[PDB]
Amino acid sequence: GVPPTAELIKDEAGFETGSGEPQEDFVADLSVDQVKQIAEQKHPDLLSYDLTNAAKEVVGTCTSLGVTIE
Amino acid sequence: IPEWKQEEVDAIVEMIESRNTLLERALDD
RNA sequence: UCUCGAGCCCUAGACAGCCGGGAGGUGAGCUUAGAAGCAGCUACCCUCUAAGAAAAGCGUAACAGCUUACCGGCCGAGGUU
């Protein structure tokens, strides 16, 4: 249904492509609140019960591309 | 006497309180 | 094929076999017209859970599909190095 993660990030990230090497080459950043919203757009695609866990899932594709958090 | 089998029994007993062998083991407590 | 010894696993059910499960984010990011476990490069993280890899081997033009891992059941006594 609702679009995939990779893209939802590249939107509120302000960039288009990832980094040749993740966690090593930080391409973009994301406030916690920003990740709190994405986790809301994917409420159906995710198995988690509480929003807390839903984040860990989303918060898993970021640092793996150079998407630090604040 | 694996440690995980012990942590499981106690883990099960914790849910009951509030592998078949492990379930039985717990129930027996 | 006979005999002697050591280590580890096992009735909290071992070894093997058979049955059932092997799931979501997500077909990871990059590269590329495309690549979705499985061309190559890099990373290899977390949910549900009794399990289930950013996938060990085949398979496809790429999917699909078939299995290993991993978990559960049936079984019941030694098994393995």
Curated annotation (Swiss-Prot), chain B:
Subunit structure: Part of the 50S ribosomal subunit. Forms part of the ribosomal stalk which helps the ribosome interact with GTP-bound translation factors. Forms a heptameric L10(L12)2(L12)2(L12)2 complex, where L10 forms an elongated spine to which the L12 dimers bind in a sequential fashion.
Highest classification ranks of the organism: Archaea, Methanobacteriati, Methanobacteriota, Stenosarchaea group, Halobacteria
Family assignment from sequence similarity: Belongs to the universal ribosomal protein uL10 family.
Boundaries of the shown chain within the full protein: 12 to 73 of 348
Note: Has been called L10e and L10E in this organism; in this case 'e/E' is for E.coli-like, not eukaryotic-type protein.
Summary of the function given for this chain in its UniProt record: Forms part of the ribosomal stalk, playing a central role in the interaction of the ribosome with GTP-bound translation factors.
Protein's UniProt name: Large ribosomal subunit protein uL10
Organism, as annotated: Haloarcula marismortui (strain ATCC 43049 / DSM 3752 / JCM 8966 / VKM B-1809)
Gene: rpl10
